[PDB]
Structure 1
Amino acid sequence: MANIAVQRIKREFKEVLKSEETSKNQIKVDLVDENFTELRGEIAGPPDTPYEGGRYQLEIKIPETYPFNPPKVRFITKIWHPNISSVTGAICLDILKDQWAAAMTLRTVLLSLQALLAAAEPDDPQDAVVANQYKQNPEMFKQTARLWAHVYAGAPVSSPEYTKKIENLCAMGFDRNAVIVALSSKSWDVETATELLLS
């Protein structure tokens, strides 16, 4: 890469390694290749959110044009959130689009992502179904999010009512993730979820 991009990355990488945040075990970034084109980030779910206790892996791609363009970031670890795709991990956050500023860093992006988990913006949604549930049924959203955090991100807490609906469907021979997706999408309505699974 261009010298400007290389120096920025190394420098940013050492900002994270030495930050208060890694020591507190909340943000983290690792190398994938030796070119610095791809990085793997990790963020801890923020406290007092349904994501609490969870750890989320992030795919980070540095463009040839860094730092005048933002890094491309996607969630590897599945998450139930209005601004992130429950299927692809795609993010809707302004700094990753037209609000990138050259002064921003890897640390600031990670911290910003953590902040988004704590504060969703459902009127600028990435995943419409999730955003609706968020607005229509907040407790349902909390629980669903906590369930995904548990299933995918290792978050500790569990919901017994949702777990047994998951097994009842998996009993029919349905793929488990498919089941979780269906139940979450359909507001835990077994009949409606089932119809989706059959379709």
Structure 2
Amino acid sequence: FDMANIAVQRIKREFKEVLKSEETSKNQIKVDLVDENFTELRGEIAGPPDTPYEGGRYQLEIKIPETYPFNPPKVRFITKIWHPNISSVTGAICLDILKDQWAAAMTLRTVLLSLQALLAAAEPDDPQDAVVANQYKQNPEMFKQTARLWAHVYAGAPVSSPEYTKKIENLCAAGFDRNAVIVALSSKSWDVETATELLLSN
């Protein structure tokens, strides 16, 4: 198990709060108990509207520290995502509430809601993923189409570029791993040749 009483009671209370929330009844957020102990949770957030993430659903790994509520939960995206403040590789998240701006009054609900707000307002000048952040600044429309394609492929969002989809299917039919292809093509500005050259170096 068991965690300290203050940690247990805070988590039971925030978990109930997420269950009863309007946001969860509108299907915007949810939390799932992974562990009878309350130390491990799985979250889910919906992509905000009018973003490349709209229509997608993003799963999160939430680990609760022994020191809760005085330290933040450890949170990572399980669902792959293309965003300047999230690692395209690990799901690691660059957000101040998860680092130095945590406050003991914050809750599972406000962390999920804050991550959805982050999807709707990236900060590319303090990035987690430099390659994504560069594309966001240097070619906004390419970034938009890449994020949307990742939302479609990994998060179940409806649409993405026909152009992009065809490049992926070309390289996958050429015998490469589908995820390696999405990553190569996304990182190399959708250039089949340097994407392919990167893929041939594995």
What TM-score bracket applies, with the shorter chain setting the length? over 0.9
How far apart are 1:77 and its partner, in Å?
0.3
Q: In 2, distance between residues paired with 1:176 and 1:59?
A: 24
Question: Out of 51, 54, 73, which is 1:52 matched to?
Answer: 54
TM-superposed CA distance for 1:194, in Å, is 0.7
Pairwise CA RMSD: 0.5
Query: Over residues 125-181 of structure 1, what are the superposed CA-to-partner deviations in whole Å (9 max), with x where a residue is unaligned?
Result: 000000000000000000000000000000011211001111111122111111011
Question: How far apart, in 2, do the equivalents of 1:171 and 1:104 lie?
Answer: 48
Deviations 1:69-90 (A, max 9, x none): 0000000000000000101100
The range that moved more, 50-59 or 160-169, is 160-169
Q: How many residues align?
A: 199
User: How far off is 1:52 after superposition?
Assistant: 0.1
- CA distances 1:31-75 after superposition (whole Å, capped 9, x unpaired): 001000000000000001000000000000000000000000000
Structure 2 distance, partners of 1:11, 1:168, is: 50
Write the mapping of 1:168-179 to structure 2, written as runs, cut at 5 A: 168-179=170-181
**Structure 1 counterpart of 2:17, from 15, 18, 36:** 15
SS across alignment from 1:187: coil
d(CA) in 1 for partners of 2:156 and 2:170? 23
TM-score normalised per structure 1? 0.99
Deviates most, 129-138 or 156-165:
156-165
What percentage of residue pairs aligned between the two structures are identical?
A: 99
Divergent runs of 4+, >2 A: none
Q: What is the CA–CA distance in structure 1 between the aligned matches of 2:107 and 2:190, rounded to whole Å?
A: 40
1:130 corresponds, among 126, 129, 132, to: 132
The answer on 1:114 being equivalent to 2:116 is: yes
**TM-score w.r.t. structure 2 length?**
0.98
Describe the superposition over 1:3-27 as per-residue Cα deviations: whole angstroms up to 9, x where unpaired: 0000000000011111110011001
Structure 1 unaligned segments of length 5 or more: list them.
none
Q: What is the SS of the residue equivalent to 1:113?
A: helix
Q: Name the SS for the 1:41 alignment partner.
A: strand
Q: Deviations over 1:98-148 (max 9, x none)?
A: 100000000000000000000000011000000000000000000000000
Inter-partner Cα distance in structure 2 for 1:36 and 1:120? 30
Matches of 1:129 and 1:177 in 2, distance apart?
A: 17
